[PDB]
Amino acid sequence: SMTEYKLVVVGAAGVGKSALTIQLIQNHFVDEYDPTIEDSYRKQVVIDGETCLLDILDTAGQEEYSAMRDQYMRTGEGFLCVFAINNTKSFEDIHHYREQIKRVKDSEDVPMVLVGNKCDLPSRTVDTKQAQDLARSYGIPFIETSAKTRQGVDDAFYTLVREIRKHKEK
Amino acid sequence: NPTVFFDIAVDGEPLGRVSFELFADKVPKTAENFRALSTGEKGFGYKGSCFHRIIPGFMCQGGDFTRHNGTGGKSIYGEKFEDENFILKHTGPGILSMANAGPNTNGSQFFICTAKTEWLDGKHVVFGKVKEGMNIVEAMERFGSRNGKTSKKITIADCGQLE
Ligand SMILES: CCn1c(-c2cc(N3CCN(C4CC4)CC3)cnc2[C@H](C)OC)c2c3cc(ccc31)-c1csc(n1)C[C@H](NC(=O)[C@H]1[C@@H]3COC[C@@H]31)C(=O)N1CCC[C@H](N1)C(=O)OCC(C)(C)C2
Ligand SMILES: Nc1nc2c(ncn2[C@@H]2O[C@H](COP(=O)(O)OP(=O)(O)NP(=O)(O)O)[C@@H](O)[C@H]2O)c(=O)[nH]1
Ligand SMILES: [Mg+2]
Numbered sequence: 001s002m003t004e005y006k007l008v009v010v011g012a013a014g015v016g017k018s019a020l021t022i023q024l025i026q027n028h029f030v031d032e033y034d035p036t037i038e039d040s041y042r043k044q045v046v047i048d049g050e051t052c053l054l055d056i057l058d059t060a061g062q063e064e065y066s067a068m069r070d071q072y073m074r075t076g077e078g079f080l081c082v083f084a085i086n087n088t089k090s091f092e093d094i095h096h097y098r099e100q101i102k103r104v105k106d107s108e109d110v111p112m113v114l115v116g117n118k119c120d121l122p123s124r125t126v127d128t129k130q131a132q133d134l135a136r137s138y139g140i141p142f143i144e145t146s147a148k149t150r151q152g153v154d155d156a157f158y159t160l161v162r163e164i165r166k167h168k169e170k
Numbered sequence: 171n172p173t174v175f176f177d178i179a180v181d182g183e184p185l186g187r188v189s190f191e192l193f194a195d196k197v198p199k200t201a202e203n204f205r206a207l208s209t210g211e212k213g214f215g216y217k218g219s220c221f222h223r224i225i226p227g228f229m230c231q232g233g234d235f236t237r238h239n240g241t242g243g244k245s246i247y248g249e250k251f252e253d254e255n256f257i258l259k260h261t262g263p264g265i266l267s268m269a270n271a272g273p274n275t276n277g278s279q280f281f282i283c284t285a286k287t288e289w290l291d292g293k294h295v296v297f298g299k300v301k302e303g304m305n306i307v308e309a310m311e312r313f314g315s316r317n318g319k320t321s322k323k324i325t326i327a328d329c330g331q332l333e
Contacts, residue, residue: 032241033271037223037317064289 002044004053005161008076010069010097012090013061015082016117019147021058024157029148036060038072047158054157066100073104078111078164080156083131085116085144086123091131098138111163112140115156120146171195172331174208176216178306179327180313188282188303189332190266193258193296200254200268200276200297203245207233207278208329212246216278221324224314228287230307231269231318232326233279243278250275258296260287264307266298282307 009017018039019030025041039058044051057072073079081097083090094114101110114135116126128144135142141159145152175189192201207215214235221232222240236242245251252274260267260283267290269279276295284307300307313322 032237032239034239034241035271037225039317064293 002051002053004055005164006055006057006075006077007080007157007160007164008057008059008072008078009080009082010059010101011061011080011082011115012084012087012093013063015061015084015087015090016145016147017061017080017082018058020080020082020115020117020145020153020156021056023147023150023153025056035062045154045158045161047161052161054161056157069100070104073101078113078160078167080113080115080160082115082117083126084118085126085131086118086121088125091116091126094134109167111160111167112138113156113160113163114138114140114142115152116142116144117147119144119151120148172201172205173301174205174331175329176208176326177328178310179325181322182325182327184327185309185324186303186306188306189301190298191301192266192298196257197254197295197297199247199251200295203247203251203276203278204266204280204297205331206246207235209331210329214244216326216329219326221310221320221326223281223318224310224320224324225316225318226284226311226314228285229281229283230310230314230324231279231281232324233269233277235278240279245277250277252276253295254297256292256295259291260294260296262286264300264304265296266300267294267296270294284308284311 018036022030025043041056043054083094116131143152143156145156171194172192175187177187178185194201219235221230223231234242263284265283268276313320
């Protein structure tokens with residue numbers, strides 16, 4: 001039938017993984033903080049003229065359970081690696097999330113997109129160039145998003161699908 | 171140490187009463203918050219609120235009586251108050267401890283352990299334990315799930331302080 005893509009959203013607590021996912025799926029913005037245990041969502045979308053089904057796993061940022069991420073990194077096909085542009089620690093955490101995915105997948109070639117979220121906020125501590133330079137050094141796309149205004153939400157998830165498709169068909 | 175009770179209901183049908191000893195001897199400010207929320211004497215509190223997160227094997231969590239969605243609640247001292255102390259540990263089933271969103275963010279949400287949860291020691295304030303009705307808390311786990319979403323509405327139909 002339509003192709004299913006297994007996407008996994010990771011990143012430090014509070015960066016907006018769930019706000020991004022709920023914007024994509026439900027078109028509304030969660031202002032309140034509901035820290036995630038683990039949630040799964042389904043949405044069909046047209047990408048490049050073809051309908052596909054997204055299966056999205058929204059993961060906990062809680063640092064205490066970092067050693068229980070292996071199981072979902074094994075099954076996920078592509079990863080949205082989210083930081084918040086006003087939280088330098090969450091940007092520093094990116095390296096560690098990516099390295100964990102590579103380790104669990106035992107691969108330097110894993111579909112991923114770097115996402116700089118909260119771009120609506122004036123408190124910016126991570127510059128676009130710094131994030132662009134980093135993504136370039138990783139060889140993956142970088143997108144700035146706001147779950148509040150929806151800027152870049154669809155583009156970040158669709159770009160990840162395109163990265164997975166390129167990898168499956170290679 | 172004071173004792174309070176919750177009369178629990180499942181989709182509005184009684185399930186039974188759980189009572190709790192509050193460790194006012196060791197955590198007086200935290201115990202008094204939960205006591206007053208249980209009686210409703212400040213004009214708000216747990217009556218009518220639900221256990222929004224139940225994860226079998228670990229705990230039953232509730233206490234959001236402001237938003238009823240797992241994000242709210244408030245203490246009798248303000249929306250949040252400080253971690254009073256971490257003297258007492260999560261030693262086994264029946265421990266009553268405060269939920270939080272990081273240091274010094276106690277409100278009204280709480281959890282009741284259904285197992286020992288040692289990795290929460292030092293992070294959540296333990297302030298009481300189940301006295302009677304632990305089997306009611308066990309019975310609440312029948313309605314939980316892996317991520318905690320519940321399959322029936324588990325409510326505190328009544329609550330108060332026991333003499
Ligand atoms: C990695 C998956 N995963 C697990 C977990 C872990 C494990 N282990 C850990 C321990 N290992 C033993 C040492 C060997 C065995 C394997 C197994 N399986 C799981 C679950 C079932 O896999 C889906 C958890 C867990 C907990 C969180 C996030 C993900 C989690 C998490 C997010 S937010 C929070 N924790 C604290 C939360 N804060 C709020 O709700 C804030 C809301 C906003 O402001 C007021 C209100 C809070 O106070 N509590 C009150 C305290 C219990 C706590 N919730 C909670 O729910 O813990 C769930 C759980 C299952 C106990 C832990
Ligand atoms: N201004 C602004 N606020 C945002 C944005 N995305 C999320 N937030 C806010 O930041 C907080 C955390 O968002 P949330 O989506 O829960 O983050 P999370 O990464 O899922 N956290 P966890 O790892 O605990 O599940 C919430 O208050 C939310 O409204 C955004 O793009 N802009
Ligand atoms: Mg989340």
